[PDB]
Design a protein around this ligand. Sequence first.
Ligand SMILES: CC(C)C[C@H](NP(=O)(O)CNC(=O)OCc1ccccc1)C(=O)N[C@@H](CC1CCCCC1)C(=O)O
Ligand SMILES: [Ca+2]
Ligand SMILES: [Ca+2]
Ligand SMILES: [Ca+2]
Ligand SMILES: [Ca+2]
Ligand SMILES: [Zn+2]
Length: 316
Amino acid sequence: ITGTSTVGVGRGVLGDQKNINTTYSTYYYLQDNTRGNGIFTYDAKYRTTLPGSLWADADNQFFASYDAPAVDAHYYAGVTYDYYKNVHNRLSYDGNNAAIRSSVHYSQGYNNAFWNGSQMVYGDGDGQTFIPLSGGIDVVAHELTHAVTDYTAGLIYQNESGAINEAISDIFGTLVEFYANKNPDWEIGEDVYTPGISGDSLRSMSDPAKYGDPDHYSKRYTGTQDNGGVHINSGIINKAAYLISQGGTHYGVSVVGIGRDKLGKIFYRALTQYLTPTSNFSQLRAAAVQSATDLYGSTSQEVASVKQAFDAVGVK
Ligand SMILES: CC(C)C[C@H](NP(=O)(O)CNC(=O)OCc1ccccc1)C(=O)N[C@@H](CC1CCCCC1)C(=O)O
Ligand SMILES: [Ca+2]
Ligand SMILES: [Ca+2]
Ligand SMILES: [Ca+2]
Ligand SMILES: [Ca+2]
Ligand SMILES: [Zn+2]
C-alpha cells in the first residue's frame, strides 16, 4: 500500500520485544519499505486462502497474543533479507528485490510452514508439536531460502535433489540464526518445537541421527514417504555442512573446520552457480569442491575440508 514508513513495536512469539518496520495509511500495516521492494506480512485468519489480508493494526503496537506470529514473521524476514544482501550481495530471493510476502495464522493447529511458490506461510502449531512457527528465525530463513533455491538451482523437491533443497534451507536457516546471534545453534526449529520438551529440536545438523535422520549416505532413505525422504536425507548434507564449518571426526574421517562464513560462501556459490534442478549428492560434492576452488584455490584448506566432509558422510 502507499503510505509513509513507520516503526512499530511489539512482542514476538517468545515474548521478546522488537521494533518492526510498518507503513501508515489510516492503519499501520506490516509493510517494511526499508528492504528491497518491501516485506509484507498478512493475516490468514486461521483459514487456508492465501495470502489473506495485509496485516493492519490501529496503533502501531503489536503486543497482543494474536500479533506475535506476525511480528516475528515480519521481523525475521527482514533479518533474512539482510543476511542475503549483506553477506551474499543478493537482493531478495530473486536477486532483484522481489517483494517478500508471508502469511501467518495459516489454518488451525497447523504444524508446519512452507513456501508455496510465491510466499511464505506459517502455521500456529497445535501448541504440542509447535508453537507459531515464525517464532523460529531458522524456520523463517529456512522458508525464505526455499524461494532462493527455487529462483537459482531450482532443485526438484524429491529424492536427492530434494534433500539438497532441504539441507540448503537448513544450512542457510542456521547461518541466518548465527547472523542474528541470539541463542544460535546447529539445531533446526528448537525455538518453536515441542514447548513441553526442553532441549530438543525438529532436526539436528550437528548430529542428525539424534532425531533419526541419516548422517551417512549408507543410511539414506530410499522409500517414497516425505517426497523420497527430503527432510530425512537432508541430514547427510546437513552433517557434511556442519563438518565443513565446525570440523570433527565422523565415522573415523577427520574434517578440519573452516568456519560458518566460508561454509556459507561455498554453499551459496554452489547453489547459485553450479547446482541444477536435478543435482544429486555426488553432484553437490562436485559443486561444493568447485565453489571452494573458485573462492580459495585448489590447494586450499577449504577445498580439502569440503572433500573430507563429503568423505565423512559417504558421498563421493
Ligand atoms: C523448518 C521446519 C519447522 C519447517 C519445514 N517446512 P518446509 O520444508 O518448508 C515444508 N515443505 C513443504 O510443505 O513442501 C511442500 C510444498 C511444495 C510446493 C508448494 C507448497 C508446498 C519442515 O522441515 N517441515 C517438516 C515439518 C514436520 C514437523 C513434524 C511433523 C511432520 C512435518 C516437514 O514438512 O516434513
Ligand atoms: Ca495494536
Ligand atoms: Ca537457537
Ligand atoms: Ca536453530
Ligand atoms: Ca521443545
Ligand atoms: Zn523445507
